[PDB]
């Protein structure tokens, strides 16, 4: 069978694989890590990898490793599943979900009038003390490579040196999203499926949020594509390309739809979970997933004290 490099939800991927396995009888392993240390990994081991398969939360790992020389193309029949808008022209990886950037506040802590126009007002001195986020991780680094890519190298370090000024740090976006909850933080930038996950359980760490999205084309609009991709040096590339197919396909993309992790469908003609914002009405800002930098984000972050 295969080994997937799995850096996407392990929810998702179980259900993924049961599907996958039983339709196809091709017996998966998966190695769970993180987007950037698996990203890192893949890059080190270069053709020794053992790895069939790469999946991602965030599509900066895609790119690292895409950068490398390290995917096979992927089938055009393959490519031809997912929207245009969510798969990277040169056709060496696939979206395989989104999930939409979110400013998420606690009604009683942040008035609505006070809402920011722009990620960029978060910058401002009226922001300082008012917002958190999670620098650590692919998640909200990602945010920052989008605005890198939209806004240039100058005004990214400006905002991130404001950040520093103005935010407050949580080791994790359910710890951001919880501090919030509890009116410990006014509110703070994360993804959209927390508090819907959240809300699928207990609801106790998401009962006194609401969401507020930028839209606009703002870079807090900016929506993080989820990435798949086939390892050149695989040793069962029909069995790889296989396994893109079938989670890009309807199996996959209606365990999008019907599961209680919340991240958005990205092929052609499918439907995301009802509960959600439909991805159309987001207005996101267009970014070329592979112009993504997780290196040079990790530098600017570093010069500012994020990190």
Excluded at 165 to 191: E, L
Excluded at 249 to 262: D, P, S, Y
Aim: proline content about 5%.
């Amino acid at each position: 069978g295969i080994v997937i490099y799995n850096a996407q939800h392990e929810n998702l991927v179980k259900s993924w694989v049961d599907g996958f396995t039983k339709d196809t009888g091709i017996k998966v392993t998966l190695r769970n890590g993180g987007d950037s240390e698996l990203g890192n990994q893949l890059v080190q081991e270069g053709s020794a990898s053992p790895a069939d398969v790469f999946l991602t939360e965030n599509s900066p790992a895609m790119v690292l490793v895409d950068n490398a020389k390290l995917f096979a193309p992927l089938d055009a029949a393959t490519l031809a599943q997912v929207e245009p808008q969510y798969r990277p022209s040169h056709g060496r990886w696939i979206g395989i979900a989104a999930r939409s950037t979110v400013f998420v506040y606690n009604p009683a802590k942040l008035s609505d009038a006070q809402l920011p126009k722009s990620l960029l007002d978060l910058a401002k001195p009226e922001w300082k003390g008012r917002w958190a986020a999670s620098p650590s991780g692919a998640d909200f680094q990602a945010i920052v490579s989008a605005l890198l890519e939209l806004k240039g190298e100058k005004a990214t370090l400006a905002w991130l040196k404001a950040m520093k000024t103005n935010f407050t740090a949580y080791k994790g976006n359910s710890t951001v999203m919880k501090a919030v909850n509890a009116g410990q933080v006014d509110s703070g930038v994360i993804y959209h499926y927390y508090p819907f996950v959240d809300g699928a359980k207990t609801g106790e760490n998401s009962n006194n949020i609401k969401l507020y999205y930028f839209k606009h084309q703002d870079p807090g609009a900016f929506v993080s594509i989820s990435g798949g991709g086939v390892l050149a040096s695989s040793k069962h590339q029909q069995q790889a390309q296989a396994f893109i197919k079938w989670i890009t396909g309807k199996q996959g993309q209606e365990i999008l739809r019907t599961n209680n992790a919340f991240e958005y469908a990205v092929g052609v003609g499918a439907a995301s979970n009802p509960k959600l914002v439909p991805l159309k009405d987001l207005d996101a800002p267009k970014v070329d997933a592979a112009q993504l930098n997780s290196k040079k984000v990790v530098e600017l972050m570093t010069e500012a004290g994020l990190l």
